[PDB]
Amino acid sequence: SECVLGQSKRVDFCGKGYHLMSFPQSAPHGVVFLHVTYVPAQEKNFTTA
Amino acid sequence: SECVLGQSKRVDFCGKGYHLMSFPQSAPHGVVFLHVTYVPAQEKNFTTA
Ligand SMILES: *[C@@H]1O[C@H](CO)[C@@H](O)[C@H](O)[C@H]1NC(C)=O
Ligand SMILES: *[C@@H]1O[C@H](CO)[C@@H](O)[C@H](O)[C@H]1NC(C)=O
């Protein structure tokens, strides 16, 4: 109800990282979610104020 | 997962009041959370439109 039909703001609920979309495939006696996320990769530091 | 590793917008979940931070101390056969909050204290009333 939450991850598929909308965007989830709860941290580490519908996937490790920031949440974008989900896809609900079926399976024998169960369901399999495919979560799509967004993870920063390359970082660089600066001086702030 | 939710209160510590991020901020929570859920009401009355990670502490009474608006939520800021939490620290997860340990304890035998359990765990103890310390929640920081934010409570408005004084009041003053006016007329609006
Ligand atoms: C940025 O972080 C690196 C650590 O990998 C550090 O050596 C460097 O001094 C930092 N940048 C500045 C401007 O200090
Ligand atoms: C503000 O609230 C008090 C109740 O404590 C009331 O007596 C007062 O008339 C109110 N002031 C205004 C401007 O509504």
Swiss-Prot record, chains A, B:
Cystines in this chain: C3-C14
Q: Name the source's superkingdom.
A: Viruses
**Residues bearing attached sugar chains per UniProt:** N45
Protein function: Subunit of the fusion protein that is processed upon entry into the host cell. Mediates fusion of the virion and cellular membranes by functioning as a class I viral fusion protein. Contains a viral fusion peptide that is unmasked after S2 cleavage. This cleavage can occur at the cell membrane by host TMPRSS2 or during endocytosis by host CSTL. In either case, this triggers an extensive and irreversible conformational change that leads to fusion of the viral envelope with the cellular cytoplasmic membrane, releasing viral genomic RNA into the host cell cytoplasm.
Q: Per its record, how is this protein called by name? A: Spike protein S2'
Report the source organism.
Severe acute respiratory syndrome coronavirus 2
Where is the organism placed in the taxonomic lineage, from the top?
Viruses, Riboviria, Orthornavirae, Pisuviricota, Pisoniviricetes
Shown stretch of the complete protein: 1030 to 1078 of 1273
